[PDB]
Tab-separated table of C-alpha atoms in Angstrom:
chain	number	residue	atom	x	y	z
A	1	UNK	CA	0.000	0.000	0.000
A	2	UNK	CA	0.873	3.685	-0.579
A	3	UNK	CA	-1.375	6.730	0.206
A	4	UNK	CA	-4.141	9.036	-1.170
A	5	UNK	CA	-5.200	12.561	-0.010
A	6	UNK	CA	-8.539	14.600	-0.207
A	7	UNK	CA	-7.889	18.079	1.227
A	8	UNK	CA	-11.454	19.382	0.842
A	9	UNK	CA	-13.184	18.899	4.188
A	10	UNK	CA	-16.950	18.641	4.034
A	11	UNK	CA	-18.447	20.263	7.118
A	12	UNK	CA	-21.817	18.664	7.933
A	13	UNK	CA	-23.995	19.547	10.927
A	14	UNK	CA	-24.256	17.331	14.015
A	15	UNK	CA	-27.759	16.141	15.114
A	16	UNK	CA	-28.564	14.618	11.687
A	17	UNK	CA	-27.621	11.761	9.325
A	18	UNK	CA	-24.590	11.907	7.049
A	19	UNK	CA	-22.933	9.582	4.573
A	20	UNK	CA	-19.401	9.756	3.244
A	21	UNK	CA	-18.588	7.517	0.275
A	22	UNK	CA	-15.012	7.329	-0.985
A	23	UNK	CA	-13.951	9.391	-4.054
A	24	UNK	CA	-13.492	6.824	-6.823
A	25	UNK	CA	-12.564	8.355	-10.179
A	26	UNK	CA	-13.123	6.415	-13.437
A	27	UNK	CA	-12.142	3.127	-11.690
A	28	UNK	CA	-14.333	1.993	-8.770
A	29	UNK	CA	-15.023	-1.805	-8.844
A	30	UNK	CA	-17.627	-3.244	-6.417
A	31	UNK	CA	-15.607	-5.525	-4.125
A	32	UNK	CA	-12.823	-3.488	-2.450
A	33	UNK	CA	-14.659	-0.896	-0.361
A	34	UNK	CA	-13.874	-0.725	3.413
A	35	UNK	CA	-13.753	2.103	6.028
A	36	UNK	CA	-11.432	2.546	9.010
A	37	UNK	CA	-11.319	4.534	12.289
A	38	UNK	CA	-9.112	7.423	13.519
A	39	UNK	CA	-5.340	6.596	13.753
A	40	UNK	CA	-5.940	3.365	11.754
A	41	UNK	CA	-8.101	0.928	13.763
A	42	UNK	CA	-10.811	-1.581	12.723
A	43	UNK	CA	-13.509	-1.308	9.963
A	44	UNK	CA	-15.853	1.213	11.624
A	45	UNK	CA	-18.573	-1.316	12.572
A	46	UNK	CA	-20.603	-3.256	9.979
A	47	UNK	CA	-24.029	-3.345	11.622
A	48	UNK	CA	-26.766	-1.146	10.144
A	49	UNK	CA	-28.000	-0.559	13.700
A	50	UNK	CA	-24.730	0.678	15.266
A	51	UNK	CA	-23.950	4.385	15.043
A	52	UNK	CA	-20.771	5.291	13.130
A	53	UNK	CA	-20.737	2.490	10.545
A	54	UNK	CA	-20.216	1.325	7.000
A	55	UNK	CA	-23.068	-0.108	4.903
A	56	UNK	CA	-23.463	-0.158	1.070
A	57	UNK	CA	-19.893	1.081	0.473
A	58	UNK	CA	-20.654	4.272	2.473
A	59	UNK	CA	-19.808	5.600	5.958
A	60	UNK	CA	-23.162	6.633	7.533
A	61	UNK	CA	-23.476	8.548	10.809
A	62	UNK	CA	-27.033	7.879	12.031
A	63	UNK	CA	-27.199	10.859	14.410
A	64	UNK	CA	-23.610	12.265	13.953
A	65	UNK	CA	-22.058	14.262	16.848
A	66	UNK	CA	-19.255	16.814	17.158
A	67	UNK	CA	-16.924	14.188	18.668
A	68	UNK	CA	-17.043	12.357	15.348
A	69	UNK	CA	-15.310	15.383	13.757
A	70	UNK	CA	-12.126	13.593	12.764
A	71	UNK	CA	-9.868	11.909	10.213
A	72	UNK	CA	-11.120	8.588	8.716
A	73	UNK	CA	-9.901	6.220	5.936
A	74	UNK	CA	-11.094	3.888	3.185
A	75	UNK	CA	-9.110	1.288	1.229
A	76	UNK	CA	-9.216	0.125	-2.347
A	77	UNK	CA	-7.206	-2.979	-3.225
A	78	UNK	CA	-9.119	-5.201	-5.706
A	79	UNK	CA	-6.094	-7.068	-7.075
A	80	UNK	CA	-3.141	-5.396	-5.287
A	81	UNK	CA	-3.033	-1.581	-5.842
A	82	UNK	CA	-3.687	-0.618	-2.236
A	83	UNK	CA	-3.247	3.041	-1.225
A	84	UNK	CA	-5.944	3.683	1.515
A	85	UNK	CA	-7.824	7.038	1.122
A	86	UNK	CA	-7.652	9.648	3.939
A	87	UNK	CA	-10.920	11.577	4.480
A	88	UNK	CA	-11.085	14.206	7.271
A	89	UNK	CA	-14.623	15.265	8.256
A	90	UNK	CA	-16.040	17.946	10.584
A	91	UNK	CA	-19.338	18.211	12.457
A	92	UNK	CA	-20.642	21.462	13.905
A	93	UNK	CA	-23.381	22.748	16.124
A	94	UNK	CA	-25.819	25.431	15.042
A	95	UNK	CA	-24.557	28.818	16.115
A	96	UNK	CA	-26.502	30.618	18.904
A	97	UNK	CA	-30.046	31.532	17.788
A	98	UNK	CA	-29.386	30.494	14.220
A	99	UNK	CA	-30.676	27.368	12.570
A	100	UNK	CA	-27.245	26.832	11.006
A	101	UNK	CA	-23.498	27.362	11.344
A	102	UNK	CA	-21.716	29.551	8.740
A	103	UNK	CA	-18.832	27.047	8.782
A	104	UNK	CA	-21.111	24.904	6.632
A	105	UNK	CA	-22.453	27.408	4.054
A	106	UNK	CA	-22.180	26.795	0.340
A	107	UNK	CA	-21.907	30.092	-1.601
A	108	UNK	CA	-24.432	30.281	-4.505
A	109	UNK	CA	-25.098	33.227	-6.851
A	110	UNK	CA	-27.874	34.285	-9.282
A	111	UNK	CA	-28.254	37.347	-11.555
A	112	UNK	CA	-30.955	39.881	-10.734
A	113	UNK	CA	-34.150	40.338	-12.780
A	114	UNK	CA	-34.387	36.700	-13.818
A	115	UNK	CA	-35.619	33.293	-12.566
A	116	UNK	CA	-32.817	31.175	-11.125
A	117	UNK	CA	-32.259	28.119	-9.008
A	118	UNK	CA	-30.460	27.469	-5.727
A	119	UNK	CA	-29.411	23.828	-5.213
A	120	UNK	CA	-29.455	21.944	-1.890
A	121	UNK	CA	-26.086	20.149	-1.920
A	122	UNK	CA	-25.167	16.493	-1.215
A	123	UNK	CA	-28.701	15.127	-1.381
A	124	UNK	CA	-27.511	12.257	-3.608
A	125	UNK	CA	-27.674	9.514	-0.897
A	126	UNK	CA	-30.799	10.553	0.949
A	127	UNK	CA	-32.370	10.410	-2.506
A	128	UNK	CA	-32.808	6.686	-2.137
A	129	UNK	CA	-36.346	6.501	-0.828
A	130	UNK	CA	-37.273	4.379	-3.837
A	131	UNK	CA	-35.101	6.761	-5.919
A	132	UNK	CA	-37.185	9.742	-4.870
A	133	UNK	CA	-35.337	12.774	-3.454
A	134	UNK	CA	-37.232	13.705	-0.236
A	135	UNK	CA	-39.668	16.623	-0.016
A	136	UNK	CA	-37.604	19.725	0.726
A	137	UNK	CA	-38.816	22.599	2.897
A	138	UNK	CA	-37.051	25.932	2.334
A	139	UNK	CA	-36.218	28.822	4.663
A	140	UNK	CA	-34.277	32.072	4.323
A	141	UNK	CA	-32.864	33.499	7.554
A	142	UNK	CA	-34.606	30.664	9.403
A	143	UNK	CA	-38.119	31.725	8.343
A	144	UNK	CA	-40.191	29.502	6.001
A	145	UNK	CA	-40.633	30.180	2.310
A	146	UNK	CA	-44.003	29.687	0.709
A	147	UNK	CA	-43.555	27.561	-2.464
A	148	UNK	CA	-46.465	29.220	-4.313
A	149	UNK	CA	-44.951	29.229	-7.828
A	150	UNK	CA	-45.351	32.989	-7.826
A	151	UNK	CA	-42.430	33.998	-5.613
A	152	UNK	CA	-40.701	30.579	-5.292
A	153	UNK	CA	-40.868	27.038	-6.648
A	154	UNK	CA	-39.472	23.837	-5.175
A	155	UNK	CA	-38.558	20.984	-7.512
A	156	UNK	CA	-36.376	18.118	-6.357
A	157	UNK	CA	-33.131	19.568	-4.899
A	158	UNK	CA	-33.783	23.103	-6.115
A	159	UNK	CA	-35.287	26.414	-5.120
A	160	UNK	CA	-36.434	28.441	-8.106
A	161	UNK	CA	-36.231	32.035	-6.969
A	162	UNK	CA	-38.532	33.988	-9.290
A	163	UNK	CA	-37.160	37.340	-10.529
A	164	UNK	CA	-34.115	37.522	-8.332
A	165	UNK	CA	-33.602	40.890	-6.576
A	166	UNK	CA	-31.099	42.393	-4.178
A	167	UNK	CA	-33.722	41.570	-1.525
A	168	UNK	CA	-33.286	37.829	-2.039
A	169	UNK	CA	-29.843	37.883	-0.513
A	170	UNK	CA	-29.470	35.918	2.680
A	171	UNK	CA	-28.777	32.482	4.109
A	172	UNK	CA	-31.166	29.840	2.886
A	173	UNK	CA	-31.677	26.354	4.260
A	174	UNK	CA	-33.247	23.324	2.723
A	175	UNK	CA	-34.763	20.671	4.979
A	176	UNK	CA	-35.426	16.976	4.439
A	177	UNK	CA	-36.308	13.952	6.636
A	178	UNK	CA	-34.634	10.656	5.669
A	179	UNK	CA	-36.129	7.343	6.788
A	180	UNK	CA	-33.274	4.999	7.764
A	181	UNK	CA	-34.260	1.696	9.397
A	182	UNK	CA	-37.866	2.771	10.014
A	183	UNK	CA	-36.634	5.755	12.057
A	184	UNK	CA	-36.538	9.081	10.149
A	185	UNK	CA	-33.687	11.513	10.761
A	186	UNK	CA	-33.451	15.173	9.701
A	187	UNK	CA	-31.115	16.875	7.152
A	188	UNK	CA	-30.192	20.543	6.404
A	189	UNK	CA	-27.815	22.558	4.120
A	190	UNK	CA	-27.247	26.331	4.202
A	191	UNK	CA	-26.673	28.322	1.092
A	192	UNK	CA	-25.478	31.909	1.276
A	193	UNK	CA	-27.282	33.525	-1.648
A	194	UNK	CA	-25.360	36.299	-3.451
A	195	UNK	CA	-27.021	38.217	-6.329
A	196	UNK	CA	-25.113	39.047	-9.503
A	197	UNK	CA	-25.744	42.129	-11.658
A	198	UNK	CA	-28.274	41.597	-14.410
A	199	UNK	CA	-26.770	40.428	-17.667
A	200	UNK	CA	-28.061	42.881	-20.245
A	201	UNK	CA	-27.283	41.860	-23.871
A	202	UNK	CA	-25.609	44.632	-25.905
A	203	UNK	CA	-24.098	44.500	-29.389
A	204	UNK	CA	-20.592	46.048	-29.591
A	205	UNK	CA	-19.857	49.283	-31.430
A	206	UNK	CA	-17.092	49.291	-34.093
A	207	UNK	CA	-15.603	52.738	-33.838
A	208	UNK	CA	-12.870	52.930	-36.471
A	209	UNK	CA	-12.995	50.709	-39.503
A	210	UNK	CA	-16.150	52.638	-40.539
A	211	UNK	CA	-16.589	51.489	-44.176
A	212	UNK	CA	-13.985	53.677	-45.946
A	213	UNK	CA	-10.935	53.766	-48.300
A	214	UNK	CA	-7.221	54.280	-47.735
A	215	UNK	CA	-4.407	55.257	-50.127
A	216	UNK	CA	-1.408	52.952	-49.850
A	217	UNK	CA	1.751	52.399	-51.827
A	218	UNK	CA	1.870	49.007	-53.520
A	219	UNK	CA	5.113	47.905	-51.897
A	220	UNK	CA	5.125	49.195	-48.322
A	221	UNK	CA	3.748	47.972	-45.013
A	222	UNK	CA	0.861	49.402	-43.012
A	223	UNK	CA	-1.040	48.878	-39.758
A	224	UNK	CA	-4.853	48.739	-39.807
A	225	UNK	CA	-6.519	49.134	-36.409
A	226	UNK	CA	-10.029	48.036	-35.388
A	227	UNK	CA	-11.396	49.912	-32.384
A	228	UNK	CA	-14.506	48.458	-30.700
A	229	UNK	CA	-16.498	49.846	-27.769
A	230	UNK	CA	-18.225	47.127	-25.798
A	231	UNK	CA	-17.691	44.581	-23.049
A	232	UNK	CA	-14.480	42.572	-22.626
A	233	UNK	CA	-16.342	39.343	-23.507
A	234	UNK	CA	-16.974	40.976	-26.921
A	235	UNK	CA	-14.357	40.130	-29.556
A	236	UNK	CA	-12.798	42.024	-32.523
A	237	UNK	CA	-11.144	40.407	-35.496
A	238	UNK	CA	-10.221	40.847	-39.098
A	239	UNK	CA	-11.211	38.850	-42.119
A	240	UNK	CA	-10.096	39.776	-45.610
A	241	UNK	CA	-11.915	38.600	-48.754
A	242	UNK	CA	-14.248	36.154	-46.998
A	243	UNK	CA	-11.425	34.657	-44.830
A	244	UNK	CA	-9.796	34.980	-41.415
A	245	UNK	CA	-6.161	35.914	-41.020
A	246	UNK	CA	-4.133	32.721	-40.590
A	247	UNK	CA	-1.552	32.452	-37.837
A	248	UNK	CA	0.774	30.919	-40.413
A	249	UNK	CA	0.204	33.761	-42.939
A	250	UNK	CA	3.467	35.405	-44.156
A	251	UNK	CA	2.197	39.008	-44.672
A	252	UNK	CA	-0.894	39.306	-42.490
A	253	UNK	CA	-0.836	39.197	-38.697
A	254	UNK	CA	-3.125	40.195	-35.800
A	255	UNK	CA	-2.259	41.591	-32.393
A	256	UNK	CA	-5.158	41.670	-29.862
A	257	UNK	CA	-5.553	44.081	-26.880
A	258	UNK	CA	-8.282	45.057	-24.338
A	259	UNK	CA	-8.721	47.910	-21.906
A	260	UNK	CA	-11.463	47.825	-19.292
A	261	UNK	CA	-13.325	51.082	-18.703
A	262	UNK	CA	-13.349	51.601	-14.895
A	263	UNK	CA	-16.479	53.820	-15.108
A	264	UNK	CA	-18.618	51.489	-17.235
A	265	UNK	CA	-17.282	48.052	-18.206
A	266	UNK	CA	-19.989	47.760	-20.925
A	267	UNK	CA	-18.103	50.585	-22.616
A	268	UNK	CA	-14.532	49.190	-22.632
A	269	UNK	CA	-12.339	49.095	-25.788
A	270	UNK	CA	-11.095	46.130	-27.830
A	271	UNK	CA	-8.108	46.890	-30.078
A	272	UNK	CA	-7.127	44.523	-32.882
A	273	UNK	CA	-4.094	45.436	-34.959
A	274	UNK	CA	-3.660	44.063	-38.492
A	275	UNK	CA	-0.065	44.315	-39.727
A	276	UNK	CA	0.469	44.046	-43.499
A	277	UNK	CA	4.199	43.624	-44.026
A	278	UNK	CA	4.030	43.970	-47.814
A	279	UNK	CA	0.932	45.312	-49.590
A	280	UNK	CA	0.205	43.071	-52.540
A	281	UNK	CA	-1.779	43.541	-55.778
A	282	UNK	CA	-4.634	41.514	-54.395
A	283	UNK	CA	-5.338	43.778	-51.331
A	284	UNK	CA	-6.721	46.484	-53.656
A	285	UNK	CA	-9.480	44.155	-54.973
A	286	UNK	CA	-11.252	43.308	-51.706
A	287	UNK	CA	-11.649	45.191	-48.439
A	288	UNK	CA	-10.338	44.254	-45.026
A	289	UNK	CA	-13.446	43.845	-42.884
A	290	UNK	CA	-13.504	44.033	-39.072
A	291	UNK	CA	-15.995	42.083	-36.948
A	292	UNK	CA	-17.380	42.898	-33.518
A	293	UNK	CA	-19.023	39.738	-32.179
A	294	UNK	CA	-20.769	38.289	-29.156
A	295	UNK	CA	-23.650	35.786	-28.605
A	296	UNK	CA	-26.248	38.436	-29.536
A	297	UNK	CA	-24.971	39.239	-33.033
A	298	UNK	CA	-22.072	40.550	-35.098
A	299	UNK	CA	-21.079	44.005	-36.412
A	300	UNK	CA	-19.073	44.809	-39.586
A	301	UNK	CA	-17.018	47.674	-40.952
A	302	UNK	CA	-14.375	47.715	-43.695
A	303	UNK	CA	-11.270	49.482	-44.991
A	304	UNK	CA	-10.829	49.348	-48.772
A	305	UNK	CA	-7.233	49.847	-49.830
A	306	UNK	CA	-6.763	51.934	-52.996
A	307	UNK	CA	-3.639	53.167	-54.878
A	308	UNK	CA	-2.680	56.802	-54.377
A	309	UNK	CA	-4.137	59.492	-56.640
A	310	UNK	CA	-1.767	60.801	-59.349
B	1	UNK	CA	-1.181	39.233	-27.744
B	2	UNK	CA	-1.361	36.814	-30.728
B	3	UNK	CA	-4.602	35.247	-29.477
B	4	UNK	CA	-7.527	36.731	-27.569
B	5	UNK	CA	-7.832	35.170	-24.091
B	6	UNK	CA	-9.970	35.744	-20.972
B	7	UNK	CA	-9.820	34.285	-17.457
B	8	UNK	CA	-13.083	32.681	-16.291
B	9	UNK	CA	-14.374	30.278	-13.621
B	10	UNK	CA	-17.350	28.133	-14.760
B	11	UNK	CA	-20.071	26.577	-12.510
B	12	UNK	CA	-22.605	24.054	-13.836
B	13	UNK	CA	-26.348	24.856	-13.863
B	14	UNK	CA	-26.779	22.994	-10.587
B	15	UNK	CA	-24.325	25.385	-8.913
B	16	UNK	CA	-21.447	22.950	-8.636
B	17	UNK	CA	-17.991	24.419	-9.088
B	18	UNK	CA	-15.091	22.614	-10.768
B	19	UNK	CA	-11.770	21.634	-9.205
B	20	UNK	CA	-8.731	19.542	-9.744
B	21	UNK	CA	-9.260	15.889	-8.860
B	22	UNK	CA	-5.515	15.251	-8.992
B	23	UNK	CA	-3.706	16.933	-11.983
B	24	UNK	CA	-4.993	15.443	-15.269
B	25	UNK	CA	-8.637	15.202	-14.129
B	26	UNK	CA	-11.373	17.608	-13.038
B	27	UNK	CA	-14.453	17.259	-10.890
B	28	UNK	CA	-17.535	19.261	-10.027
B	29	UNK	CA	-18.929	19.623	-6.473
B	30	UNK	CA	-20.564	22.383	-4.434
B	31	UNK	CA	-17.820	24.162	-2.441
B	32	UNK	CA	-18.169	25.513	1.119
B	33	UNK	CA	-17.530	29.217	1.752
B	34	UNK	CA	-13.923	28.473	2.827
B	35	UNK	CA	-12.638	26.228	-0.009
B	36	UNK	CA	-13.826	28.655	-2.749
B	37	UNK	CA	-10.198	29.150	-3.857
B	38	UNK	CA	-9.973	25.470	-4.827
B	39	UNK	CA	-11.708	26.166	-8.158
B	40	UNK	CA	-9.783	26.138	-11.429
B	41	UNK	CA	-9.306	29.367	-13.255
B	42	UNK	CA	-9.485	28.850	-17.009
B	43	UNK	CA	-7.867	30.676	-19.861
B	44	UNK	CA	-10.533	30.687	-22.529
B	45	UNK	CA	-8.908	31.556	-25.809
B	46	UNK	CA	-10.928	32.496	-28.877
B	47	UNK	CA	-9.395	30.127	-31.374
B	48	UNK	CA	-10.337	30.170	-35.035
B	49	UNK	CA	-12.545	27.377	-36.342
B	50	UNK	CA	-16.029	27.281	-37.865
B	51	UNK	CA	-17.438	30.647	-36.831
B	52	UNK	CA	-21.151	29.961	-37.251
B	53	UNK	CA	-22.252	33.126	-35.435
B	54	UNK	CA	-24.504	31.144	-33.026
B	55	UNK	CA	-21.310	29.331	-31.952
B	56	UNK	CA	-17.899	30.696	-31.026
B	57	UNK	CA	-14.889	28.310	-31.076
B	58	UNK	CA	-12.739	28.311	-27.955
B	59	UNK	CA	-9.808	26.605	-26.257
B	60	UNK	CA	-10.121	25.786	-22.552
B	61	UNK	CA	-6.913	25.603	-20.595
B	62	UNK	CA	-5.992	25.627	-16.954
B	63	UNK	CA	-4.618	29.149	-16.190
B	64	UNK	CA	-0.866	28.981	-15.564
B	65	UNK	CA	-0.943	25.204	-15.310
B	66	UNK	CA	-0.163	24.418	-18.992
B	67	UNK	CA	-3.025	22.001	-19.440
B	68	UNK	CA	-5.658	22.030	-22.133
B	69	UNK	CA	-8.980	20.258	-22.249
B	70	UNK	CA	-9.015	18.093	-25.361
B	71	UNK	CA	-11.303	15.435	-26.822
B	72	UNK	CA	-9.938	12.171	-28.128
B	73	UNK	CA	-11.271	8.800	-29.083
B	74	UNK	CA	-10.617	6.429	-26.207
B	75	UNK	CA	-12.067	2.993	-26.853
B	76	UNK	CA	-14.031	4.132	-29.897
B	77	UNK	CA	-15.912	6.586	-27.650
B	78	UNK	CA	-15.465	10.369	-27.549
B	79	UNK	CA	-13.833	11.248	-24.248
B	80	UNK	CA	-12.561	14.321	-22.370
B	81	UNK	CA	-9.001	14.447	-21.096
B	82	UNK	CA	-6.480	16.988	-19.830
B	83	UNK	CA	-3.171	17.136	-21.635
B	84	UNK	CA	-0.131	19.284	-21.110
B	85	UNK	CA	1.382	21.185	-23.982
B	86	UNK	CA	4.380	23.433	-24.535
B	87	UNK	CA	3.973	26.810	-22.751
B	88	UNK	CA	5.967	28.653	-25.459
B	89	UNK	CA	3.884	27.409	-28.379
B	90	UNK	CA	0.629	27.821	-26.429
B	91	UNK	CA	-2.023	29.110	-26.547
B	92	UNK	CA	-2.390	29.389	-30.342
B	93	UNK	CA	-5.284	30.877	-32.375
B	94	UNK	CA	-4.884	27.938	-34.780
B	95	UNK	CA	-5.703	25.122	-32.380
B	96	UNK	CA	-5.796	21.404	-33.193
B	97	UNK	CA	-9.399	20.194	-33.356
B	98	UNK	CA	-9.217	18.120	-30.162
B	99	UNK	CA	-8.910	21.176	-27.884
B	100	UNK	CA	-11.666	22.946	-29.740
B	101	UNK	CA	-15.142	23.492	-28.284
B	102	UNK	CA	-17.894	25.700	-29.708
B	103	UNK	CA	-19.196	28.010	-26.924
B	104	UNK	CA	-23.004	28.123	-27.416
B	105	UNK	CA	-25.081	30.605	-25.395
B	106	UNK	CA	-28.835	29.980	-25.195
B	107	UNK	CA	-30.496	31.703	-22.186
B	108	UNK	CA	-27.327	33.133	-20.713
B	109	UNK	CA	-26.687	29.363	-20.445
B	110	UNK	CA	-23.390	27.988	-21.775
B	111	UNK	CA	-22.842	24.638	-23.524
B	112	UNK	CA	-19.514	23.536	-24.915
B	113	UNK	CA	-19.878	21.236	-27.917
B	114	UNK	CA	-16.776	19.488	-29.096
B	115	UNK	CA	-15.713	20.686	-32.548
B	116	UNK	CA	-13.914	17.389	-32.972
B	117	UNK	CA	-16.858	15.308	-31.788
B	118	UNK	CA	-20.127	17.177	-32.413
B	119	UNK	CA	-23.118	16.057	-30.280
B	120	UNK	CA	-20.725	15.509	-27.353
B	121	UNK	CA	-20.421	18.277	-24.721
B	122	UNK	CA	-18.515	19.096	-21.566
B	123	UNK	CA	-20.690	17.500	-18.865
B	124	UNK	CA	-21.013	16.887	-15.143
B	125	UNK	CA	-23.110	14.489	-13.132
B	126	UNK	CA	-25.937	15.311	-10.734
B	127	UNK	CA	-23.678	13.474	-8.341
B	128	UNK	CA	-21.437	15.363	-6.016
B	129	UNK	CA	-17.681	15.188	-6.561
B	130	UNK	CA	-17.698	13.177	-9.787
B	131	UNK	CA	-15.314	13.959	-12.702
B	132	UNK	CA	-15.964	16.440	-15.523
B	133	UNK	CA	-16.381	14.362	-18.727
B	134	UNK	CA	-17.581	14.537	-22.355
B	135	UNK	CA	-21.192	13.417	-22.470
B	136	UNK	CA	-23.069	12.427	-25.585
B	137	UNK	CA	-26.757	12.234	-24.701
B	138	UNK	CA	-26.759	15.907	-23.579
B	139	UNK	CA	-30.110	15.707	-21.750
B	140	UNK	CA	-29.815	12.061	-20.658
B	141	UNK	CA	-29.799	13.508	-17.122
B	142	UNK	CA	-26.227	14.770	-17.313
B	143	UNK	CA	-25.535	18.476	-17.090
B	144	UNK	CA	-24.268	20.188	-20.237
B	145	UNK	CA	-25.183	23.740	-19.153
B	146	UNK	CA	-22.834	26.148	-17.334
B	147	UNK	CA	-22.342	29.781	-16.148
B	148	UNK	CA	-19.205	31.825	-16.502
B	149	UNK	CA	-17.622	34.253	-14.193
B	150	UNK	CA	-14.810	36.445	-15.456
B	151	UNK	CA	-11.804	36.999	-13.286
B	152	UNK	CA	-11.528	40.785	-13.740
B	153	UNK	CA	-11.010	40.820	-9.947
């Protein structure tokens, strides 16, 4: 045997059930699974009725206390590749007056002015009630939410917050009651809900390659610059004669830049520089077009190269 | 800069974040308010491919970790994998098809279809702490929808 880690410590609350299966990546195999106690002892019981114990390849806690808050193990060795997984769990008590402990919050965000969903974590095991995730009750700041389908909707593990506002911020809790061996235990998760600014869709504005002409000498080299005014997730690129500029092109080359506007990020500037090392006969036939694109539509503007006037 | 790149975070539609499940593999789970720095920052490059307007080709690589999500045939089945590349040569705007995903935005909801293997998207399971993979049924029950957060701060 060798060793395996798992630095992320899942902090569950004491007073309720909890399961902790071992993290098996693509390779699991069903005939290797076994849990162990603190400072390597025996296989943490094997009786469904005992308290801290292992059942269907999972370490259940029946009523879980704070004293359980410690380092555990699991070992996989089907043929020989033994390395015994280290876990490290923590159980907390609800803080004074609260119906939760912040040490156990899961941070979840949703953009304002639109219907979103908060998800009650780790409900994957308690699901098994004939493969039916238990009926969840929801609360924000320890008060109960009415699931009217006007202000909120509850479906499986999620809370559909209708038309998210700044006033939806707060600590939410989802509650379920899992029946284990005839006796039903409780379950809760807290979610600190943080609202994101509404995502308004806006097409970018091409400022400089505004459909014009430019006099250039047939041999020389020039720099064509596309200036766009939009968000940083908006892009700006050149295409010449129905085609993009290839990275492996010997005379054409792009250089991309961005500069966020501190005062209004929806009005930042994209700068795409086209460097023509040697102007060729062909560049006078078709214009160099510049495209401002995002998911909500493109924008075009060209520069038609022409020979100088005699 | 030769290629246009942005730093983002990605969370699936079920609110699960993504993290390293031992370098060369990723996994999605809901993270507690303390471990929030465990999530992988991506370097989404706008690579050139089939710009269909309703799709935007991209390259997804782990920040300053020199790893790029690619799609290869493993056992005659399209599969996701993380592979290291040369930091000097990468990222390129002319990316090999395997690392290329078309970023599709429906209702402010992101899907990443594989340019190499169309009808196969970056997916996650409803399950907690399972790996990030390439899923082919899309709505089979597996999550193919995500959200993006830019690291402008």
